[PDB]
A paper describes a structure:
Protein lysine methyltransferases (PKMTs) comprise a subfamily of posttranslational modifying enzymes that transfer a methyl group from the cofactor S-adenosyl-L-methionine (SAM). [name] ([name]/Pr-SET7/[name]) is the sole PKMT annotated for monomethylation of histone H4 lysine 20 (H4K20me) and many nonhistone targets such as the tumor suppressor p53 and the p53-stabilizing factor Numb. Disruption of endogenous [name] leads to cell cycle arrest and chromatin decondensation, consistent with essential roles for [name] in transcriptional regulation and DNA damage response. Here we solved four distinct crystal structures of [name] in alternative ligand-binding states with covalent [name] inhibitors and native ligands.
Our prior efforts led to the development of covalent inhibitors containing 2,4-diaminoquinazoline arylamide and multi-substituted quinone scaffolds by targeting Cys311. Upon further optimization of these scaffolds, we identified [name] (Inh1) and SGSS05NS (Inh2), two structurally distinct covalent inhibitors with the desired potency against [name]. Notably, despite the overall structural similarity of the pre-SET, SET, and SET-I motifs, the Inh1- and Inh2-[name] binary complexes (BC-Inh1 and BC-Inh2) differ from the [name]-SAH-H4 ternary complex (TC) by the distinct conformations of their post-SET motifs. Moreover, the post-SET motifs of BC-Inh1 and BC-Inh2 adopt more extended configurations with a less structured loop and a singly-kinked helix, respectively. Whereas multiple factors may influence the overall conformations, the formation of Cys311 adducts likely made the key contribution to the discovery of these hidden post-SET motif conformers. Interconversions between metastable conformers cover a broad spatio-temporal scale in particular associated with motions of [name]’s SET-I and post-SET motifs. In the apo landscape, the general structural features of the X-ray structures of BC-Inh1, BC-Inh2, APO, BC-SAM and TC are recapitulated by a subset of macrostates (e.g. A6 for BC-Inh1; A10 for BC-Inh2; A12 for APO; A20 for BC-SAM; A22, A24 for TC, 6 of 24 macrostates, Figure 11).
Author numbering:
A (entry chain B): 246 to 379
B (entry chain A): 246 to 384
Amino acid sequence: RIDELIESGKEEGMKIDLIDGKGRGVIATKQFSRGDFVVEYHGDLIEITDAKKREALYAQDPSTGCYMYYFQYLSKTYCVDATRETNRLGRLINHSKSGNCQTKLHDIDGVPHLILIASRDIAAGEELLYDYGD
Amino acid sequence: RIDELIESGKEEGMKIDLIDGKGRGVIATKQFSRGDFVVEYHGDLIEITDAKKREALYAQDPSTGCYMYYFQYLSKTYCVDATRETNRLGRLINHSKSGNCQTKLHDIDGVPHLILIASRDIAAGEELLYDYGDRSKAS
Ligand SMILES: */C=C\C(=O)NCCCNc1nc(N2CCCC2)nc2cc(OCCN)c(OC)cc12
Ligand SMILES: */C=C\C(=O)NCCCNc1nc(N2CCCC2)nc2cc(OCCN)c(OC)cc12
């Protein structure tokens, strides 16, 4: 239904670009409707003890930012750790208080996935910008 | 003991300074022996449900970093949120993979407090630098 895109792992309709005056960002290359799946925030799904271990081990200054997103799913606390400098576009989508992408928890076979959903219609060539949807 | 230093918020023994090449840091103005209490990482103590609402409402870009520290306490997941720019020095202590300060969970009347203890002897004049508590099965 929508699990198909998650399992796919494809990241279609977006590309990397220099936003002139902004620096790096992710750009829509196709039109999105409100409600459409945009992209997964891909990362290791881990419990909170492993998250504390990884956090303590990563050789990163906290001033450069954190890729570890905590959330609660079915009474349990999880972490999606995108620290690995992957080639996934989801973790390079920039933030904005008034974004065109909101976060959603999507469950497949009991496993939570952190995905971005279009919160409005988006034009080809627009910058994809996320907000914490809650 | 450590506990009245914490509830008092008195943070003596350290001072803000600009370090050559680095910018703001916190400096030891007295000696600390290994194991001594240094400072609390002080913030609002909140449950994760409110951590997520706060995270969603802050107009902060993630590339300048996050003051929100998640941990588990007995049953629940809590968060220490030091986002607010306060008078408190714990949140300004820079990070290092080879620092002189370790985090630990210190409890006071059933409330978790995330504190920095000295991981080695610190001389006055040294910059305080923190790492997240090491995990070992040793004494
Ligand atoms: C992705 C891992 C990560 O960034 N974790 C952030 C955890 C919370 N943020 C900070 N936590 C602390 N302490 C934890 C307990 C002892 C200190 N300290 C800082 C210090 C910071 O800056 C100091 C000045 N450069 C920042 O900057 C955002 C965050 C945290
Ligand atoms: C103190 C709040 C905080 O920093 N929270 C961090 C949450 C995890 N970090 C990031 N999470 C996301 N998403 C969560 C779900 C949708 C997107 N995205 C980013 C993007 C980032 O960079 C964008 C490109 N500059 C960063 O940079 C560290 C972190 C997160």
